[PDB]
Amino acid sequence: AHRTLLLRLSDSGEPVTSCSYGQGVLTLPSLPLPQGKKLGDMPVYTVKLAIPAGSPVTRDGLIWTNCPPDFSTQFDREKFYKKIIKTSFHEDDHIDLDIYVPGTYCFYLSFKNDKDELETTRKFYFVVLPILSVNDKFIPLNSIAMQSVVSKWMGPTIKDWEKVFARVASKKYNMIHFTPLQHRGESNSPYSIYDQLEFDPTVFKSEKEVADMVERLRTEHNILSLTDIVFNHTANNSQWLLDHPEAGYNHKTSPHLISAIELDKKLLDFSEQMEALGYPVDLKTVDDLIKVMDGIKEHVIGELKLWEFYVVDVKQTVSELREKWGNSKSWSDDNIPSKDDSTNLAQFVRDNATEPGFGSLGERGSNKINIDKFAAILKKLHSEDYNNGIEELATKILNDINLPFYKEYDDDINEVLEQLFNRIKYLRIDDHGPKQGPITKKLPLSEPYFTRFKAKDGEEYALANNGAIWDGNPLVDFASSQSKAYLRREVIVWGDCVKLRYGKGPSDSPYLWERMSKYVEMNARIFNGFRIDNCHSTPLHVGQYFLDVARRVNPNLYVVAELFSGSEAMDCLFVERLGISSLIREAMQAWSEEELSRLVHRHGGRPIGSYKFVPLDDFPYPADVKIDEEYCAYNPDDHSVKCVSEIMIPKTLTATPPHALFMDCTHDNETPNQKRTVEDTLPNAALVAFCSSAIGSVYGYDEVFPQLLDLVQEKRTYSCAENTGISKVKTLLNNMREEIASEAVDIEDSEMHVHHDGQYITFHRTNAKNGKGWYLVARTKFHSSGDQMLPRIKLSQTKATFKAAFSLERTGDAPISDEIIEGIPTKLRELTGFDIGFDENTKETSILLPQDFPQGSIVIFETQQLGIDDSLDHFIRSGAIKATEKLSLESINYVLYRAEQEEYDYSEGRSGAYDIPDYGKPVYCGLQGWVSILRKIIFYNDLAHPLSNNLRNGHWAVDYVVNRLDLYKDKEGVAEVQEWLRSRMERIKQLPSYLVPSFFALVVGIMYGCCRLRAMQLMSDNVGKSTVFVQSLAMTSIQMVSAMKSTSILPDQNIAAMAAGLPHFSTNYMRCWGRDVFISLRGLLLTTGRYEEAKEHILAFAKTLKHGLIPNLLDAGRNPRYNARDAAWFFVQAIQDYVTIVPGGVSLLQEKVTRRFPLDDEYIPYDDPKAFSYSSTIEEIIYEILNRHAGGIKYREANAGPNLDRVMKDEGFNVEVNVDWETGLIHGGSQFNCGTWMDKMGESEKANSVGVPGTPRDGAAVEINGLLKSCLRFVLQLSKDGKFKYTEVTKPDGSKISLSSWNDLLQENFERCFYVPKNKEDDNKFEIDATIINRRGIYKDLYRSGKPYEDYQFRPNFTIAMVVAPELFTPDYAAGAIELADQVLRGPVGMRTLDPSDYNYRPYYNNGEDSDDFATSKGRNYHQGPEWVWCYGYFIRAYHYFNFLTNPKCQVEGSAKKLKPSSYLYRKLYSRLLKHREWIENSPWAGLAELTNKDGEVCNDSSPTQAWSTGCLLDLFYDLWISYEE
């Protein structure tokens, strides 16, 4: 059915962590195959790799993976297969990895670097767990019960073993771990294997004899089997070691140990003559040890030649100097240090005259000097005659060379004898280890460091035996050359075993690899898995190769390993590459009760009430996605991995901590009788069994054996004594876990609470799906530490039920047999008296323990949380799609967004945003305000967050989500969305308090995702199929477009009205701004597909035309403000954008609006019946604007006075606009004016700037004239097409100018008036006064401005003209001008409003400055430095266009030999948007800010989400889409 996981990648190709589970591994969940399907019928899993669109990896990117393409192809570690990444600047690419067999798989990505070179990422691994079934019933991995049994103690016959099998089958174990069933070595230790290729001749004779026994265990007792596999060593007496001695490290293969060999055999030879030469051979005196130690120092250390292994043979070099004194002589280097600089000169000879392998160990005299290169230096330094003091000089240098070697030797020898005498004392003088037997050949003074034999090749050899350094790093091969442990005697050896020298591969030890391969696949044919002792000491490449050979034989190979590497990260890396399925954890390692509770806490599960993962505002919502319309397209027999909700965003693949196999007692740790007591066997095994993981135990733990069995010496047999000790309880524990294994699946599905009080440990196991749980009270018996009484146990919203209770008591000591291992007689008394009180009001269960509850007892309760059934998850994960069926792009605004001021508008100031105690209010009143806070809470499982606390303290926030929508109930689809929230929140309130936060976030997140998907479906295809970033920008369109009560766009009605920004531009007269609306109209409405809403705004403002101008401040169409020389031309540009994009958009031209205010610019007539009066068409409105500007205007502001602008000066109200017909440019404004977008008016009385505009842009503005040229080009081609008529324009006098002539006037005179030529020679060609110019290569920001220094100021406004009227610019001039803006005026997120190299540059906006600075106080800086985000949109839109015309590297051909941008240009475009993608990702408001201080510094006064900040970035994506993506 659906076994697909989503693995989103970052921009560098690294997997993305969906949740913080800790240091882990990309493990895929263990699940059975579909009903009646084998390996190969279908892929076991499919990993969907998601690559971000436009990321640097997509540039000629390829996905590599060693996953075979089909089931027929075998797995190869190093054969990777190609997968093509489909590059796009809008759409992310998904590449499936079909997996057919469990194993270790990895993937890496290759791409084209920014250096045009090839680059590769890391290898990223992910494990598919094996499928474990017994007959035809699936065994979940966390329900495995493993019984470890030692072969040589189960009996001499196979039937003697099958009696043990029946005992562990009654205890209901489902897996048996075997110590290696091979022929054992001399010492008969199970791990020193004599021959790897044949089993124990005492019991078996062939593979079929042991294969039938394991298959018998499967069919008879329903038990799987696995063995230990020994890679690190073999027995010291293998008949194949005589044939192939190179399989270990010897004097040939590892020459560095030659020094250690001659020391081991010396020590043993001294042991033979210990009392002969000296006498102390077996005493308990520390002085007696000192005598033999001094004997060692004089009988071995002194007889070992002062160790020439380090030091250079001084006199033997001088002897050889005279010999070749006269051959390759003379040097030339003048750097040769002076003879006075002894140390410096000493090491100079070391670097130049040495034979290969200097300083390192080898043979006796392996470190020597190159003579012809040494004597050549002496001739150059001293004299060419030898007897001239060379013997003194040469010896002096060599003696100083050996100074570090001698100190290296003293430090080595000291750690030899310290290690020796310390070990000698312990091994002899019983401190904690006795057996101080008079030394013998079997018990020599020194433990055997090397195994000696005479090989079949004739020569003698000395293979050592591995072991372990005390506290050394196990990742270091102590037998390799990097370690000096065998020399310094820092090795605790195992004489039973012998080295196994693997190299870099089969080339270094051919027979060893071939033999171990056939040895591995032999056990792989029989058993279900392997167990690896000291896996951390086996090299990675060694473990990787043989485990893959096994999985080729047994595809469902279950791997266990005792893995204690340096850290958790190294543990995860070993699990990643080796494919380990479970890690061994030992419960006996806990020294105290607190250490045991912390161990059980690690492997118990997640906290109770843990948050559940949901796709939120960080996911793409493709409009063309499959959906579970009612979460019903799941069949249990399919065994499919479920999606999170009705939306089919597949289950995310995230790193989870590697699985654990919790052993209450292994075959190497001491018995509870030894470390603690025998009574602790019951509570210790119960706490382990309650963990949500695999569990196991050694044989004898349940049968309370007295002490740990010596794996080397002991020969006694397991007792046939049935049903002893805990065998009855383990039958209960394993049978209980079988009932739980049927439904518990993933890591979020099993939760836990653990408490430790004194000697008691509390374990509360909980299933998060149904509410079923277990409660365990276990009194531990580490020591008999007196009576302790546990306080009252209290469970909230839960009912308890007594299951079972037991006590373990000791009835004397264990029998002392010599032929059979028998345990300690123990009584297992069932307990009673547990009072379970239930308060039928508070629904609180109280549990009191009985006073007869001795140490070593347990009690199990069955529990069930109230309000949770099996049908709760389906009710929450369904119905939300059907509830959003009637939602519209306007109505989604009330469900998701609404600022508190926008909510006060509908609630008359009563409601607002929910106040979270000790935190604050969410940014939006809708779900977006919750999702912005919950995403980090769900990611970290922060149950201590103030919102998490408030959600379980009461149902206030739960009812707040549903009660808000009463304000917007009558709107499209909101009522049905409220009813879904009402029905789901009501069911949630019936749950326990501690479970409310996790379920509250799940309900909000599900409805949020359904609302965001509904938005992408209602929008166009370019948006509804793009990356998260584009969709996040498109959701801003919903934030701004909403119906209000205190304002609108029509004076008669109350309809949708695009706000300028939230929250400071949303209510009353501050919401709609004509300039702001029509800059964002193309981005927020046309790019998204809101065609009818874009028409309503064009028609609404068309009613308020006056002076031939469009008003900036729109008071819903009643008394608007006409101080906007900018708005009319952004408005006429939005009409062109509408007609160009909307199909049949020419129909807008003949739409008749009822023009309020008379044509003759009369007076404010809101009541006067001459308001409605006459109608005007849009075609007429356009011509009215063009002709009125041409014919000249003249007006003082209507209702002029402070009443409007309480700071504007009297002359400031009479603004005007006139067209210089010599040039064609439209001039207008004054030094008391703000008629452009930089409209900051002074309000400082201290700095005396009241009335003084910060940025008056009087004269010819670039944007106005650029939009004028765009409008003229629009109406010319329109009259040609017949949709426009008017072709004549008037004059202030009364003449007439053709529209084409006005169009040509700008074409002939625009660039002349504005471009500042780089050539100082062409200032006589572009109307420039060189006295006032900051930089050249700049299109002037103004023409004929009042203060002419503002004419030549570098401001970002010229980009508007470059985008809307590119014909006004010669390509080479514009390309260089916009490259300067990129280097100078471009900030990280916003565009700098003024060149930093100006004296007026003040880039920090503080609208509360009450200082004396004329330019900074009260926010006069507004447009003199601060970085605005919308100007970045117009900038990069033209930066893309003119780089496509100029730089040829930004061009590429292909389809239809049509020029599409190169990946080099897409790379430059993608880079300039990372800060914008970061901003909208990590902002509580789900948009882009209005303003930013210098260099990305957050401006507090800036509105955090602005309409035209995100709309202009949507303009860029539509340019690249509508022109290339066809």
Ligand X SMILES: OC[C@H]1O[C@H](O[C@H]2[C@H](O)[C@@H](O)[C@@H](O)O[C@@H]2CO)[C@H](O)[C@@H](O)[C@@H]1O
Ligand Y SMILES: OC[C@H]1O[C@H](O[C@H]2[C@H](O)[C@@H](O)[C@@H](O[C@H]3[C@H](O)[C@@H](O)[C@@H](O[C@H]4[C@H](O)[C@@H](O)[C@@H](O[C@H]5[C@H](O)[C@@H](O)[C@@H](O)O[C@@H]5CO)O[C@@H]4CO)O[C@@H]3CO)O[C@@H]2CO)[C@H](O)[C@@H](O)[C@@H]1O
Ligand Z SMILES: OC[C@H]1O[C@H](O[C@H]2[C@H](O)[C@@H](O)[C@@H](O[C@H]3[C@H](O)[C@@H](O)[C@@H](O)O[C@@H]3CO)O[C@@H]2CO)[C@H](O)[C@@H](O)[C@@H]1O
Residue 260: burial class (beta carbons within 10 Å; 0-12, 13-18, 19+): buried
d(CA 1034, CA 1027): 11
Binding test (CB under 6 A) with ligand Z, winner from 511, 591, 919, 956: 956
Q: Which are the contacts of 302, defined by CB distance < 8 A and separation ≥ 6?
A: none
The three-state DSSP-derived secondary structure of 845-909 is EEEECCCCCCCCEEEEEEEEECCCCCCHHHHHCCCHHHHCCCCCCCHHHHHHCCCHHHHHHHCCC
Hey, which residues between 359 and 388 contact ligand Z (CB under 6 A)? none
- Residue 728, CA distances (Å) to 554, 733, 805, 808, 828 in order: 34, 9, 12, 12, 9
Report if residue 1334 touches ligand X, rule: CB under 6 A. yes
1399 binds, among ligand X, ligand Z, ligand Y, none (CB under 5 to 8 A by kind): ligand X
536 catalytically annotated = yes
CB of 1493 vs ligand Y, minimal distance in Å: 13
Both tokens assigned to 1105? 């035309």
Q: Which residues of 1472-1504 are buried (b: 16+ CB within 10 A; e: fewer)?
A: bbeebbebbeebebbbbbbbbbbeeeebeebbb
Task: Quickly count: other Cβ atoms within 10 Å of residue 1344's Cβ.
Answer: 17
Upstream peptide bond of 102 is cis (omega within 30 degrees of 0):
no
Binding test (CB under 6 A) with ligand Z, winner from 100, 204, 527, 914: 914
Active-site annotation holder among 183, 244, 536, 659: 536
d(CA 827, CA 305): 67
**Span near ligand Y by CB under 6 A; candidates 479-487, 1222-1230, 1238-1246, 1345-1353:** 1238-1246
1334 binds, among ligand Z, ligand X, ligand Y, none (CB under 5 to 8 A by kind): ligand X
Which of 1121, 1468 has the CB closer to ligand Y? 1121
Which of 498, 1512 has the CB closer to ligand Y? 1512
Which of 864, 1334 has the CB closer to ligand X? 1334
**Span near ligand Z by CB under 6 A; candidates 200-208, 442-450, 896-904, 949-957:** 949-957
Q: With CB under 6 A as the rule, give the number of residues binding ligand Y.
A: 15
Q: Which are the contacts of 130, defined by CB distance < 8 A and separation ≥ 6?
A: 30, 102, 529, 555, 556, 557, 558, 581
CB of 1516 vs ligand Y, minimal distance in Å: 24
Which of 8, 1257 has the CB closer to ligand X? 1257
Active-site annotation holder among 412, 668, 746, 966: 668
1241 binds, among ligand X, ligand Z, ligand Y, none (CB under 5 to 8 A by kind): ligand Y
Hey, which residues between 1102 and 1121 contact ligand Y (CB under 6 A)? 1113, 1121
R_g (Cα) of the chain, nearest Å: 43
Write 1344-1349 long-range contacts (CB < 8 A, 24+). Answer: 1344/1220, 1344/1227, 1344/1258, 1344/1259, 1344/1260, 1345/1256, 1345/1257, 1345/1258, 1345/1259, 1346/1229, 1346/1230, 1346/1231, 1346/1256, 1346/1258, 1346/1259, 1347/1231
Judge contact between 1496 and 1386, C-beta under 8 A.
no
Which of 979, 1398 has the CB closer to ligand X? 1398
Binding test (CB under 6 A) with ligand Y, winner from 283, 455, 648, 1204: 1204
d(CA 1015, CA 874): 24
Report if residue 492 touches ligand X, rule: CB under 6 A. no
**Span near ligand X by CB under 6 A; candidates 633-641, 1173-1181, 1394-1402, 1435-1443:** 1394-1402
Which of 1193, 1394 has the CB closer to ligand X? 1394
CB of 956 vs ligand Z, minimal distance in Å: 4
Which of 1066, 1249 has the CB closer to ligand X? 1249
956 binds, among ligand Y, ligand Z, ligand X, none (CB under 5 to 8 A by kind): ligand Z
Judge contact between 850 and 745, C-beta under 8 A.
no
Binding test (CB under 6 A) with ligand Y, winner from 1206, 1285, 1320, 1325: 1206
- Residue 1235, CA distances (Å) to 383, 726, 1076, 1080, 1203 in order: 93, 90, 13, 19, 19
Binding test (CB under 6 A) with ligand X, winner from 972, 1398, 1481, 1519: 1398
Judge contact between 659 and 140, C-beta under 8 A.
no
Report if residue 983 touches ligand X, rule: CB under 6 A. no
d(CA 1103, CA 1152): 10
915 binds, among ligand Z, ligand Y, ligand X, none (CB under 5 to 8 A by kind): ligand Z
CB of 1226 vs ligand X, minimal distance in Å: 24
Residue 219: burial class (beta carbons within 10 Å; 0-12, 13-18, 19+): exposed
1409-1428 footprint of ligand Y as x/- string (CB under 6 A):
----------x--x------
CB of 1349 vs ligand X, minimal distance in Å: 3
**Span near ligand Z by CB under 6 A; candidates 52-60, 218-226, 632-640, 910-918:** 910-918
Report if residue 1200 touches ligand Y, rule: CB under 6 A. no
Report if residue 438 touches ligand Z, rule: CB under 6 A. no
326-365 footprint of ligand X as x/- string (CB under 6 A):
----------------------------------------
Report if residue 1289 touches ligand Y, rule: CB under 6 A. no
Q: Which residues of 914-936 are buried (b: 16+ CB within 10 A; e: fewer)?
A: bebeeeeebbbbbbbbbbbbbbe
User: Chain-centre distance of CA 800, in angstroms?
Assistant: 40
Look at residues 182, 177, 170, 160 and name the one whose alpha carbon lies nearest to residue 214.
177
Binding test (CB under 6 A) with ligand Z, winner from 406, 409, 960, 1069: 960
d(CA 466, CA 486): 10
CB of 1427 vs ligand X, minimal distance in Å: 20
288 catalytically annotated = no
Hey, which residues between 916 and 935 contact ligand Z (CB under 6 A)? 917
Matching residue, tokens 């027929």? 72
Report if residue 1408 touches ligand Z, rule: CB under 6 A. no
Hey, which residues between 1465 and 1504 contact ligand Y (CB under 6 A)? 1501
Which of 367, 950 has the CB closer to ligand Z? 950
Which of 796, 1400 has the CB closer to ligand X? 1400
**Span near ligand Y by CB under 6 A; candidates 134-142, 256-264, 1204-1212, 1508-1516:** 1204-1212
In 1259-1320, which ranges are E strands? Answer: 1260-1261, 1288-1289, 1297-1298, 1315-1316
Report if residue 1221 touches ligand Z, rule: CB under 6 A. no
Question: Where does 910-1019 have alpha helices with state H?
Answer: 927-940, 946-953, 956-963, 974-989, 996-1018
Mapped onto helix, strand or coil, the DSSP state of residue 939 is: helix
CA angle 12, 16, 22 (to 5 degrees): 125
Both tokens assigned to 1301? 């002539």
Which of 391, 1398 has the CB closer to ligand X? 1398
425 binds, among ligand X, ligand Z, ligand Y, none (CB under 5 to 8 A by kind): none
**Span near ligand X by CB under 6 A; candidates 383-391, 526-534, 603-611, 1393-1401:** 1393-1401
Active-site annotation holder among 92, 533, 1258, 1351: 533
Matching residue, tokens 């003249």? 1194
d(CA 690, CA 672): 19
Which of 1395, 1409 has the CB closer to ligand X? 1395
756 catalytically annotated = no
Residues at the site binding ligand Y, with contacts judged by CB under 6 A: 1064, 1069, 1113, 1121, 1123, 1204-1206, 1239-1241, 1407, 1419, 1422, 1501
Applying CB under 6 A, the residues found at the interface with ligand X are 1332-1334, 1349, 1398-1400
**Residues annotated catalytic, as ranges:** 533, 536, 668
Interacting residues with ligand Z (CB under 6 A):
914-915, 917, 950, 953-954, 956, 960
